């Protein structure tokens, strides 16, 4: 596996708006307790999963779990870019898997949650 993405980074200029506090309170922890958002709450787990495959497909990971501790630790700059790691996220799991795959399915739910909770921000 793969070190999991940085979290804080003391020379990274860092910013705390009112779209980055919504992204957490409300994007982020409306998505994290929908029914098919425990796979991506974490980092994949390739050893666990006997999927030494994922990590020579997919180069840029991203989770759920990383963007929470990165917006708590407010290592963003703006919210589009923690609006890229949803969208890298989401893009991983399309590249990886087929359409029509049970993670597949539960990605593109996951991801019109999300792009309706965004479609507004303050
Ligand atoms: C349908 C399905 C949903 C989730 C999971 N699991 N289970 C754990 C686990 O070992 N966990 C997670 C939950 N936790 C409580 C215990 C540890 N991790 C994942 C997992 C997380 C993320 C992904 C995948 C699996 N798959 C695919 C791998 C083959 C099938 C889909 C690929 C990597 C995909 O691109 N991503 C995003 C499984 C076995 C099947």
């Keep these: 596996n793969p ?3 940085e979290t804080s980074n003391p020379n990274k200029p860092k910013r705390q708006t009112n779209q980055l506090q919504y992204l ?11 029914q098919f958002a425990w796979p991506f709450q974490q980092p ?3 050893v666990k999963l006997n999927l030494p495959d994922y990590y ?10 990383t963007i929470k501790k990165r917006l708590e630790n407010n290592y ?3 919210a589009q870019e923690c609006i890229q790691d949803f969208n890298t996220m989401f893009t991983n799991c399309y590249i990886y898997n087929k ?4 993670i597949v ?3 593109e739910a996951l991801e019109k ?3 309706q909770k965004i479609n507004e921000l303050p």
């Design 3 to 5: 070190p999991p993405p």
């Design 24 to 34: 957490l309170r409300v994007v982020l922890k409306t998505l994290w307790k929908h």
């Design 44 to 46: 994949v787990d390739a």
């Design 56 to 65: 020579k497909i997919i180069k840029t990971p991203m989770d759920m779990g």
């Design 76 to 78: 963003y700059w703006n």
């Design 99 to 102: 359409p029509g795959d049970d």
């Design 105 to 107: 399915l539960m990605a």
């Design 113 to 115: 949650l999300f792009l």
